[PDB]
C-alpha cells in the first residue's frame, strides 16, 4: 500500500531540495508539489487501476517540466540538468512503460508515449519505443511509415 507510495516520494526529495538551493522555487511551493504528487501517487498504486489516473500523473510532470524551463530562462541558469530534468523524465518513462504493458491495444497511448520521447528523451530511448510498438502492432501499415519517417 502506502509503503510503495512512501517509497516513491522519498525518491522525489533530492531534486526538490536542489530546486530550493537554486532559488527557483520557494519552500512553500516545494510543500505544494509534494502534497499534489502524493495524491496522484495514491491513485496509480491502488488495486483497482484506471487509465485516466496514469494520464493525470503524466500530465502533471509535463506541466512541472514546463514551469521549471520558463523560470530557468529568466534566471539564466543552465546547470544541474541531470539532477533535476533527467530525474523527472526517467520517472515519467516508468509510468508510460507500466501503462503500455497494462493496455497494449491502445494505439493512442502508444503515440502519446512516442510524442513524449521526441520532446524529452534520448533518441536511443525512442528507438526502443517504436520497436516495442511495432512488435504487437505490425498489422497497421501507417505505424511503419511513422517510424520510417522519423
Amino acid at each position: 500500500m502506502a509503503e510503495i507510495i512512501q517509497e516513491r516520494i522519498e525518491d522525489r526529495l533530492p531534486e526538490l531540495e536542489q530546486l530550493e538551493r537554486i532559488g527557483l522555487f520557494s519552500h512553500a511551493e516545494i510543500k505544494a508539489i509534494i502534497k499534489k504528487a502524493s495524491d496522484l501517487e495514491y491513485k496509480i498504486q491502488r488495486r483497482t487501476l484506471f487509465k485516466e489516473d496514469f494520464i493525470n500523473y503524466v500530465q502533471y510532470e509535463i506541466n512541472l517540466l514546463e514551469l521549471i524551463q520558463r523560470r530557468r530562462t529568466r534566471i539564466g541558469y543552465s546547470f544541474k540538468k541531470d539532477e533535476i530534468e533527467n530525474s523527472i523524465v526517467h520517472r515519467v518513462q516508468g509510468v508510460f512503460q507500466r501503462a503500455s504493458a497494462k493496455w497494449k491495444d491502445d494505439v493512442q497511448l502508444w503515440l502519446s508515449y512516442v510524442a513524449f520521447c521526441k520532446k524529452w528523451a534520448t533518441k536511443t530511448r525512442l528507438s526502443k519505443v517504436f520497436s516495442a510498438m511495432l512488435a504487437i502492432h505490425s498489422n497497421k501499415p501507417a505505424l511503419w511509415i511513422m517510424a520510417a519517417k522519423w
Binding site: 537554486i22 502533471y60 529568466r74
Partner: protein, 50 residues
C-alpha cells in the same frame, strides 16, 4: 566557508526576488496547474469571495 554559504544564501534571495516581480500570463496559468489556487490569508480570501 561561512562567507561562501552566505554568498549562496544571498544568491537564493536575489533569484527569488527576480522570479516574483514580473510574471507572464503563461506562467500564471502554469502555476495554477502545478500549485493550485489556494489562499491562506483571511482578508485576501474574503476579497476573493466577495
Amino acid at each position: 566557508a561561512v562567507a561562501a554559504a552566505e554568498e549562496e544564501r544571498r544568491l537564493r534571495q536575489r533569484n527569488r526576488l527576480r522570479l516574483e516581480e514580473d510574471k507572464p500570463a503563461v506562467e500564471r496559468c502554469l502555476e495554477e496547474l502545478v500549485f493550485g489556487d489556494v489562499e491562506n490569508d483571511e482578508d485576501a480570501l474574503l476579497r476573493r469571495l466577495r
